[PDB]
Design an enzyme around this catalytic site. Structure first.
Site, PDB file in Angstrom:
ATOM      1  N   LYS A   1       0.856  -1.187   0.000  1.00  0.00           N
ATOM      2  CA  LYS A   1       0.000   0.000   0.000  1.00  0.00           C
ATOM      3  C   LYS A   1       0.900   1.249   0.000  1.00  0.00           C
ATOM      4  O   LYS A   1       1.935   1.301   0.689  1.00  0.00           O
ATOM      5  CB  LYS A   1      -0.986  -0.053   1.193  1.00  0.00           C
ATOM      6  CG  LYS A   1      -2.293   0.798   1.056  1.00  0.00           C
ATOM      7  CD  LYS A   1      -3.450   0.297   1.991  1.00  0.00           C
ATOM      8  CE  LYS A   1      -4.680   1.233   1.916  1.00  0.00           C
ATOM      9  NZ  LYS A   1      -5.850   0.890   2.827  1.00  0.00           N
TER      10      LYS A   1
ATOM     11  N   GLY B   1      -8.681 -11.171  -2.486  1.00  0.00           N
ATOM     12  CA  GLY B   1      -9.055  -9.766  -2.423  1.00  0.00           C
ATOM     13  C   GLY B   1     -10.032  -9.533  -1.277  1.00  0.00           C
ATOM     14  O   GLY B   1      -9.985 -10.237  -0.265  1.00  0.00           O
ATOM     15  N   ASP B   2     -10.913  -8.549  -1.467  1.00  0.00           N
ATOM     16  CA  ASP B   2     -11.907  -8.160  -0.480  1.00  0.00           C
ATOM     17  C   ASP B   2     -13.204  -8.978  -0.620  1.00  0.00           C
ATOM     18  O   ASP B   2     -13.591  -9.402  -1.726  1.00  0.00           O
ATOM     19  CB  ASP B   2     -12.203  -6.645  -0.564  1.00  0.00           C
ATOM     20  CG  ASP B   2     -13.015  -6.261  -1.801  1.00  0.00           C
ATOM     21  OD1 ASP B   2     -12.424  -6.005  -2.878  1.00  0.00           O
ATOM     22  OD2 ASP B   2     -14.253  -6.176  -1.691  1.00  0.00           O
TER      23      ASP B   2
ATOM     24  N   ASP C   1     -15.239   1.258  10.209  1.00  0.00           N
ATOM     25  CA  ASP C   1     -15.556   1.036   8.802  1.00  0.00           C
ATOM     26  C   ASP C   1     -15.642  -0.464   8.476  1.00  0.00           C
ATOM     27  O   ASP C   1     -15.190  -0.912   7.410  1.00  0.00           O
ATOM     28  CB  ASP C   1     -14.532   1.774   7.921  1.00  0.00           C
ATOM     29  CG  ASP C   1     -14.966   1.897   6.472  1.00  0.00           C
ATOM     30  OD1 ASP C   1     -16.153   1.661   6.154  1.00  0.00           O
ATOM     31  OD2 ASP C   1     -14.091   2.220   5.629  1.00  0.00           O
TER      32      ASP C   1
ATOM     33  N   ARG D   1     -16.287  -4.895   2.014  1.00  0.00           N
ATOM     34  CA  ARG D   1     -15.174  -4.300   1.247  1.00  0.00           C
ATOM     35  C   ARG D   1     -13.877  -4.177   2.047  1.00  0.00           C
ATOM     36  O   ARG D   1     -12.805  -4.054   1.466  1.00  0.00           O
ATOM     37  CB  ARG D   1     -15.565  -2.936   0.683  1.00  0.00           C
ATOM     38  CG  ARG D   1     -15.582  -1.813   1.709  1.00  0.00           C
ATOM     39  CD  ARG D   1     -16.136  -0.474   1.165  1.00  0.00           C
ATOM     40  NE  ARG D   1     -16.564   0.323   2.313  1.00  0.00           N
ATOM     41  CZ  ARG D   1     -17.780   0.271   2.864  1.00  0.00           C
ATOM     42  NH1 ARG D   1     -18.736  -0.492   2.350  1.00  0.00           N
ATOM     43  NH2 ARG D   1     -18.042   0.994   3.930  1.00  0.00           N
ATOM     44  N   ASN D   2     -13.980  -4.223   3.376  1.00  0.00           N
ATOM     45  CA  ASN D   2     -12.809  -4.121   4.256  1.00  0.00           C
ATOM     46  C   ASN D   2     -12.419  -5.424   4.940  1.00  0.00           C
ATOM     47  O   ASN D   2     -11.499  -5.464   5.759  1.00  0.00           O
ATOM     48  CB  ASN D   2     -13.004  -2.999   5.275  1.00  0.00           C
ATOM     49  CG  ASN D   2     -12.847  -1.650   4.652  1.00  0.00           C
ATOM     50  OD1 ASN D   2     -12.157  -1.516   3.636  1.00  0.00           O
ATOM     51  ND2 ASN D   2     -13.512  -0.635   5.218  1.00  0.00           N
TER      52      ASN D   2
ATOM     53  N   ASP E   1      -8.099  -2.913   6.345  1.00  0.00           N
ATOM     54  CA  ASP E   1      -8.342  -1.476   6.239  1.00  0.00           C
ATOM     55  C   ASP E   1      -8.648  -0.734   7.545  1.00  0.00           C
ATOM     56  O   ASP E   1      -9.812  -0.539   7.932  1.00  0.00           O
ATOM     57  CB  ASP E   1      -9.418  -1.189   5.199  1.00  0.00           C
ATOM     58  CG  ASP E   1      -9.543   0.295   4.885  1.00  0.00           C
ATOM     59  OD1 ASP E   1      -9.014   1.136   5.651  1.00  0.00           O
ATOM     60  OD2 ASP E   1     -10.200   0.628   3.879  1.00  0.00           O
TER      61      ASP E   1
HETATM   62  N1  LIG Z   1      -3.575  -7.188   1.918  1.00  0.00           N
HETATM   63  C1  LIG Z   1      -4.308  -7.270   0.774  1.00  0.00           C
HETATM   64  N2  LIG Z   1      -4.285  -8.370  -0.017  1.00  0.00           N
HETATM   65  C2  LIG Z   1      -5.004  -8.440  -1.157  1.00  0.00           C
HETATM   66  N3  LIG Z   1      -5.814  -7.465  -1.617  1.00  0.00           N
HETATM   67  C3  LIG Z   1      -5.932  -6.295  -0.930  1.00  0.00           C
HETATM   68  C4  LIG Z   1      -5.168  -6.138   0.332  1.00  0.00           C
HETATM   69  N4  LIG Z   1      -5.456  -4.913   0.814  1.00  0.00           N
HETATM   70  C5  LIG Z   1      -6.325  -4.341  -0.060  1.00  0.00           C
HETATM   71  N5  LIG Z   1      -6.614  -5.147  -1.111  1.00  0.00           N
HETATM   72  C6  LIG Z   1      -7.552  -4.835  -2.240  1.00  0.00           C
HETATM   73  O1  LIG Z   1      -7.573  -3.431  -2.538  1.00  0.00           O
HETATM   74  C7  LIG Z   1      -8.793  -2.818  -2.068  1.00  0.00           C
HETATM   75  C8  LIG Z   1      -8.488  -1.549  -1.272  1.00  0.00           C
HETATM   76  O2  LIG Z   1      -7.812  -1.872  -0.049  1.00  0.00           O
HETATM   77  P1  LIG Z   1      -8.155  -1.080   1.318  1.00  0.00           P
HETATM   78  O3  LIG Z   1      -9.631  -1.243   1.624  1.00  0.00           O
HETATM   79  O4  LIG Z   1      -7.181  -1.528   2.389  1.00  0.00           O
HETATM   80  O5  LIG Z   1      -7.743   0.418   0.826  1.00  0.00           O
HETATM   81  P2  LIG Z   1      -8.640   1.767   0.952  1.00  0.00           P
HETATM   82  O6  LIG Z   1     -10.105   1.453   0.802  1.00  0.00           O
HETATM   83  O7  LIG Z   1      -8.013   2.801   0.048  1.00  0.00           O
HETATM   84  O8  LIG Z   1      -8.308   2.102   2.497  1.00  0.00           O
HETATM   85  P3  LIG Z   1      -8.734   3.421   3.315  1.00  0.00           P
HETATM   86  O9  LIG Z   1     -10.191   3.241   3.660  1.00  0.00           O
HETATM   87  O10 LIG Z   1      -7.807   3.385   4.504  1.00  0.00           O
HETATM   88  O11 LIG Z   1      -8.469   4.564   2.355  1.00  0.00           O
HETATM   89  C9  LIG Z   1      -9.503  -3.872  -1.222  1.00  0.00           C
HETATM   90  O12 LIG Z   1     -10.944  -3.735  -1.195  1.00  0.00           O
HETATM   91  C10 LIG Z   1      -8.976  -5.180  -1.808  1.00  0.00           C
HETATM   92  O13 LIG Z   1      -9.735  -5.626  -2.944  1.00  0.00           O
HETATM   93 MG   LIG Z   2     -11.292   0.020   2.155  1.00  0.00          MG
END
Ligand SMILES: Nc1ncnc2c1ncn2[C@@H]1O[C@H](COP(=O)(O)OP(=O)(O)OP(=O)(O)O)[C@@H](O)[C@H]1O
Ligand SMILES: [Mg+2]
Lengths: 12, 294
Positions: free
Chosen positions: B41, B93-94, B143, B147-148, B161
């Protein structure tokens, strides 16, 4: 992603 | 920094999901593996100062967590630029994307059937276990949503997340009134009304996650705008049961959506309720069955 899963609202 | 990783050890391979999250290779990050496939990330170049602060807070928060049902931080590249946050790669993924992939007519249908009842119960127990751990560590997630939640190679579900996660050691609540870009369709009525976040308001979101599982991640309160959901839920409104949703899950969901936060179950209660209906490895890996759950 899912930006539509958030909206601009007021709480409190 | 015991978390610091040499930058030369990270290789980015593709984009996983938009700050861009990448799939990467990390050499010599996990004992007994010369090279590990990881998620990485990073922060956008145009991220505001608030966003840059929150990203660093998120990484910091993750350093204190060790739970099989929580996404593991593996390291941080913080020497030079940019900052890389290295974590456990979640192969599926999510949960929201995963669940939507399991719809009969989904283009990306992986050719596997939708979740059985046992599989849904297993997911529930794993999510609740990760959340029980988080709560015991005195954090509120804020949250919790499909999705998280993230899905491993073996379909283990883990909490991810931690962007909205706040320390509640001193008071057992976090309060933030005012305007924000907020996950309204997941939020408890008292959070909407009083701006207060607690493990009980995380429990409301857990109910919505159960609803996501049994609806294959439909959008909650479809046909309603964000501002109408705000009114609706504050006034005692909640979600209807998905088509063919199993009765046992419905019962749980309704318990999560008690208007009075004091009447909702705790995450330990959820795990306790489900503990006899789980895969045999669960007590070997769960926070619930761990010496730490004291
Ligand atoms: N450790 C992981 N392994 C695989 N896929 C991931 C991982 N982290 C995130 N993803 C994919 O990327 C997407 C975004 O990740 P995440 O929800 O952590 O980021 P974000 O929504 O930008 O976070 P924030 O709410 O802190 O801004 C997830 O929904 C998932 O599909
Ligand atoms: Mg997220």
């Amino acid at each position: 992603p899912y930006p539509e899963d958030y909206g601009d609202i007021e709480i409190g | 920094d015991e978390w610091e990783v040499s930058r030369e050890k990270i290789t980015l391979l593709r984009e996983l999901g938009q700050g861009m999250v990448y799939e990467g290779n990390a050499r010599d990050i996990i004992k007994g593996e010369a090279e590990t496939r990881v998620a990485v990330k990073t922060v956008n170049e145009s991220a505001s100062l608030r966003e840059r602060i929150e990203f660093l807070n998120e990484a910091s928060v993750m350093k204190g967590f060790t739970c099989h049902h929580v996404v593991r931080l593996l390291g941080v590249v913080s020497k030079g630029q940019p900052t890389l946050v290295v974590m456990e790669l979640m192969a599926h993924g999510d949960l929201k994307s995963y669940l939507r992939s399991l719809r009969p007519e989904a283009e990306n249908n992986p050719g596997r059937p939708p979740p059985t009842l046992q599989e849904m119960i297993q997911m529930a127990a794993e999510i609740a276990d990760g959340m029980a751990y988080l709560n015991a560590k005195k954090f509120v997630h804020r949250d919790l949503a499909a999705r998280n939640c993230m899905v491993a190679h073996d379909f283990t579900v883990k909490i991810g997340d931690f962007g909205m996660t706040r320390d509640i050691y001193e008071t057992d609540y976090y309060r933030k009134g005012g305007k924000g870009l907020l996950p309204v369709r997941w939020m408890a009525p008292e959070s909407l009304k009083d701006g207060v976040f607690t493990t009980s308001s995380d429990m409301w979101s857990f109910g919505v996650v159960l609803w996501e599982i049994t609806s294959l991640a439909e959008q909650p309160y479809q046909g309603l705008s964000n501002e109408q959901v705000l009114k609706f839920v504050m006034d005692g409104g909640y979600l209807d049961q998905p088509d063919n949703c199993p009765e046992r899950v419905t019962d749980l969901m309704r318990m999560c959506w008690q208007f009075n936060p004091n009447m909702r179950p705790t995450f330990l209660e959820i795990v306790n309720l489900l503990k006899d209906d789980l895969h045999p490895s669960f007590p070997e890996v769960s926070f619930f069955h761990s010496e730490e759950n004291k």
